[PDB]
Amino acid sequence: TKPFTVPILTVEEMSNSRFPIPLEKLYTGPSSAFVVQPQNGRCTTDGVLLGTTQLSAVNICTFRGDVTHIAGSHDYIMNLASQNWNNYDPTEEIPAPLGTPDFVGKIQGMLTQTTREDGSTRAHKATVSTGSVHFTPKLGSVQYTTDTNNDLQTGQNTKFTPVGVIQDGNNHQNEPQQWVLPNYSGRTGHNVHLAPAVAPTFPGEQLLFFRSTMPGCSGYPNMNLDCLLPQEWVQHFYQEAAPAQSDVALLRFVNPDTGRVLFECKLHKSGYVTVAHTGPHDLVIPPNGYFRFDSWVNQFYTLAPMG
Amino acid sequence: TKPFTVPILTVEEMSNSRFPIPLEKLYTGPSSAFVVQPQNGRCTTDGVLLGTTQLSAVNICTFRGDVTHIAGSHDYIMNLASQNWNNYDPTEEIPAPLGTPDFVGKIQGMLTQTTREDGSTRAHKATVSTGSVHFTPKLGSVQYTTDTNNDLQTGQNTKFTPVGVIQDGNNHQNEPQQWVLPNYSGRTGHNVHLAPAVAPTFPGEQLLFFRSTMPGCSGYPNMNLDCLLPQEWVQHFYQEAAPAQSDVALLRFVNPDTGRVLFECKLHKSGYVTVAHTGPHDLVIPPNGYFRFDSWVNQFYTLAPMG
Ligand SMILES: C[C@@H]1O[C@@H](O[C@@H]2[C@@H](O[C@H]3O[C@H](CO)[C@H](O)[C@H](O)[C@H]3O)[C@@H](O)[C@@H](CO)O[C@H]2O)[C@@H](O)[C@H](O)[C@@H]1O
Ligand SMILES: C[C@@H]1O[C@@H](O[C@@H]2[C@@H](O[C@H]3O[C@H](CO)[C@H](O)[C@H](O)[C@H]3O)[C@@H](O)[C@@H](CO)O[C@H]2O)[C@@H](O)[C@H](O)[C@@H]1O
After folding, report:
1. What's the CATH code of the domain at B29?
2. Are residues B186 and B138 in the same domain?
3. Does the C-beta of A151 come closer than 6 Å to ligand 2?
4. Which of B307, B270, B299 is nearest to B203 (CA)?
5. Helix, strand, or coil here: A135?
6. Residue B218: CB within 6 Å of ligand 2?
7. How far, rounded to the nearest angstrom, does the alpha carbon of residue B268 sit from its chain's CA centroid?
8. Which residue of chain A comes nearest to B82, CA vs CA?
9. Nearest ligand atom owner, CA of A216
10. Which of B115, B120, B122, B154 for mutating ligand 1's site (highest number of atoms within 8 Å of CB)?
11. Whole-angstrom Cα Rg for chain A
């Protein structure tokens, strides 16, 4: 049978699947108090993409299309196009355009556009609030608040490149809310075709998150961003498409230097990881360590307590 | 022997290896009038990374470190740290920090920083001119021109996220110059440990470039960006590390739908591609097509004319 495997990349050599930035560390903790249902970075070990997950690490949280000024403000409406600048098809059985951000927050970046006729270009700092009623990706439109009100032109390809997140008001780190999905269709209707919510079912286990620190652009934002799978893992499963021989793949985090294993964990065929541990914990790992698929096991396999 | 292969991704599903943006099209044309010696996106089919090439698609053209204001200006000096925020080692036998931009141009993006003590954050538009004498990556420092002169703090992690390129003066598209390497050490000394220059040696052949359109942020910039290998190809060869059985791997661009081949090309073990064609040409390809390694051939193999 097509042997299953995970890439041999180290945590720092990989990218976060929920925002275009590299992974930084591994984190585990209880999740019973949240609804863990991210839409980006979702894929079966079988290679089946889920939610709004797409292959490009750099295309996550980016938008493309054309814009029109909101008279009397420094705001603009962008009529979305697909990443390749083609028409966006709302008919597809997906939650929203692939790569759409999957959390409620204020993402700041830059809008850039070129005038086809003469090749003149321009850029403006802008922020898109995913918690806003005007955040309607699925319907084909999103809104930005910018610093300008006269330089962006109508009917010209425009792109939004994400940089980081901002926060307002006292009560620091109150936003963004990484575990709260935005309303892809606004008030027009509920979210559709979502990748399922995830939770550790085996007693004594907790989810293992691949963590990054989203850059902050203003205020006191909660910058923690946890994904269920590194972007390269999504890329790998997709191309390998190896058949899962059980519902659980046993992985060992090994140090290529010493050749020794640090801990083992469960990669569920559904596309998420759990370890045997109770309580929040920032994992200390050798910079050169990586994951290695060792064997398929039963869903009733008890993991060696994490260390 | 470990069978050699290239990823099954389509052009649009892949990323440019010289700037954090997706690939858009395939381009070929004469290169005898230029010095094709890019440092990013360089890797042997064997999996040996070259120049300033690193694995992360999102880390290309990004800088990390701390900054200090240049009194009397809106400029800042950044003392570089490695991508993981650790000390930058100038001793390494590399041209400059992995991921350093490899072309002379004015790259605009945003500097973001967080104050460790209270978690307050800030962001400012900034541009780094790689043709400036102050562009000294290899020495551990680069300079930015910004829109502020009082909000960035000293001794605080700061990151530069690239967005696009700008241009000044009449004579449009004069810059950037994608084939002109910047002086990594400034005037302190010549560039060192460069990946070799590349050129088609076989009569009737031209290099095959993987092209993207860098977003423009101001003026009339030449936005064309050609890399020798998709970033995922670099990632793939690195992990696969399959032994080259000849100096030339024959690839066929195939359409997974019709199952038919469009054209064939040469992937030199050194890490670049050539096709049989004379003159500039924007390749028209089926959106679902991809490359497939079919066989190792002699360096004297004549390619079927490209179509
Ligand atoms: C927490 C605080 O956030 C930033 O300040 C914002 C402020 O932004 C503007 O003013 C600052 C300093 O005067 C910089 O120039 C920014 O570039 C400006 O955009 C506004 O968003 C107001 C609205 O209440 O709140 C402040 O907190 C940041 O610049 C500060 O350094 C600091 O991190
Ligand atoms: C080619 C031209 O480039 C941009 O204009 C720049 C200009 O930028 C400022 O002014 C414009 C319009 O007044 C926008 O507000 C920008 O956001 C500003 O930064 C400067 O760089 C000057 C210096 O000569 O040159 C202009 O060409 C762009 O905004 C224009 O739309 C246009 O594409």
Report:
1. 2.40.510.10
2. no
3. yes
4. B299
5. coil
6. yes
7. 18
8. A12
9. 1
10. B122
11. 20
Given A7, A163, A220, which is nearest B120 (Cβ)? A220
Q: What single DSSP character describes residue A122?
A: E
Residue given tokens 């008001």 in the structure block: A169
As a residue count, chain B comes to 307
Q: Are residues A45 and A82 in the same domain?
A: no
Helix (H, G, I), strand (E, B) or coil at B260: coil
Tokens of B216: 């423009």
- Give the residue, by CA position, lying nearest to ligand 1 atom 1: A219
Q: Check whether residue A285 and residue A146 sit in a common domain.
A: no
Report the CATH number at residue B90.
Answer: 2.40.30.120
Quote the CA–CA distance of A233 and A235 in Å, as a whole number: 5
Q: Which two tokens stand for residue B209?
A: 């470039």
Ligand 2 atom nearest A121 alpha carbon: 33
Give the separation between CA B86 and CA B92, rounded to whole angstroms: 14
Q: Are A138 and A88 in contact (CB under 8 A)?
A: no
Reported structure resolution in angstroms: 2.0
- A169 chain-B contacts, CB cut-off 8 A: none
Q: What is the largest CA-CA distance in chain A?
A: 65
Q: Are residues B53 and B108 in the same domain?
A: no
d(CA A35, CA A158): 34
Q: How far is CA B116 from CA A172, A220, B81, B154, B156, in A?
A: 14, 11, 16, 12, 7
Based on the fold, state whether residues B143 and B216 are members of the same structural domain.
Answer: no
Mutate to test the interface with A, among B58, B211, B231, B236 (most CBs of A within 10 A): B58
Q: Last residue of some domain: A107, A138, A166?
A: A166
Residue A120, ligand 2, Cβ within 6 A: yes
Contact B123, B112 (CB under 8 A): yes
> Taking Cα atoms as reference points, which of A38, A96, A92 lies closest to residue A63?
A96
Shortest-distance ligand to the CA of residue B113: 1
* No. of helices (H) and no. of strands (E), chain B: 1, 15
Nearest CA, atom 25, ligand 2 = B219
Which of A281, A274, A280 lies closest to A297, judged by CA? A274
**Does B192 lie in the same domain as B305?**
yes
Query: Domain residues for A161?
Result: 60-166
Provide the token pair at B123.
């962001």
**Are residues A216 and B121, on separate chains, in Cβ contact within 8 Å?**
yes
Residues A127, A131, A132: CA angle, nearest 5 degrees: 75
Whether A8 and A26 map to the same domain: the answer is: yes
Of A188, A92, A85, A195, the closest CA to residue A136 belongs to A188
- The residue among B10, B49, B112 with the most chain A CBs within 10 A of its CB, best to mutate, is B112
Residue finishing a domain among B142, B166, B190: B166
ω into A182 cis (within 30 of 0): no
